[PDB]
């Protein structure tokens, strides 16, 4: 139907917007600490600790399949990256601190993205 096409056009431009957002958020991780899933070969006990792993590569895969229906779904995944890290790693580690900095610096980006998604519809 025409309605379905219209819907798919909105999804496509949402995906376009979120691609930009994801790029800006990943720029705030210059150490690439969150770039790839935590290796279960190198960290064998990880899944005993973290029940829903997430990372930028995995988000990007979902993104390009147009798998984020709205900004909330995207933000959930971003928050998993940060929250998993702040639980698995202690406060005095480069990993925990990178998560804090990513959350802080990311807030600006996400604040504007929400306004753009709302405004553009
Ligand atoms: C192989 O060495 C490692 C692997 C993972 C981590 C923690 N990373 C995250 C995102 O939690 C630390 C050391």
CA of 103 to the centre of ligand 1 (A): 17
CB 95 within 8 A of CB 85: yes
Residues with Cβ within 8 Å of 84's Cβ and at least 6 positions away in sequence, in order, are 50, 52, 53, 54
Residue 41 phi/psi, 5° resolution?
-75, -40
- What is the structure's resolution, reported in angstroms to one decimal? 1.8
CATH number of the domain within which 34 lies? 1.20.920.10
* Structure tokens given for 5: 């096409």
Question: Which atom number of ligand 1 is nearest to the Cα of residue 34?
Answer: 10
Tally the domains of the chain: 1
- Residue 101 belongs to domain spanning: 1-121
Is 42 near ligand 1, meaning CB less than 6 Å away? yes
The Cα–Cα gap between 121 and 108 comes to: 20
DSSP 84-121: HHHHHS-TTSHHHHHHHHHHHHHHHHHHHHHHHHHHH-
Tally the residues of the chain: 121
Q: Are 113 and 13 in contact (CB under 8 A)?
A: no
The answer, yes or no, to whether any atom of ligand 1 lies below 6 A from the CB of 56, is no
Record the tokens describing residue 117, joined without a space: 């998604």
Q: What is the distance between the alpha carbons of residues 108 and 93, in angstroms, rounded to a whole number?
A: 24
Count Cβ atoms below 10 Å from residue 94 Cβ, excluding itself. Answer: 10
């Amino acid at each position: 139907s025409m309605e379905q096409v219209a819907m798919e056009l909105r999804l496509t431009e949402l995906t376009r917007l979120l691609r930009s957002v994801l790029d800006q958020l990943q720029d705030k991780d210059p150490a690439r600490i969150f770039a790839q899933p935590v290796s279960l070969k190198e960290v064998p006990d990880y899944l005993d600790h973290i029940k829903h792993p997430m990372d930028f590569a995995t988000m990007r895969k979902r993104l390009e399949a147009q798998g984020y229906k709205n900004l909330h779904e995207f933000e959930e995944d971003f928050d998993l990256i940060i929250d998993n890290c702040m639980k698995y790693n202690a406060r005095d580690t480069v990993f925990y601190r990178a998560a804090v900095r990513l959350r802080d610096q990311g807030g600006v980006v996400l604040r504007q993205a929400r306004r753009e998604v709302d405004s553009i519809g």
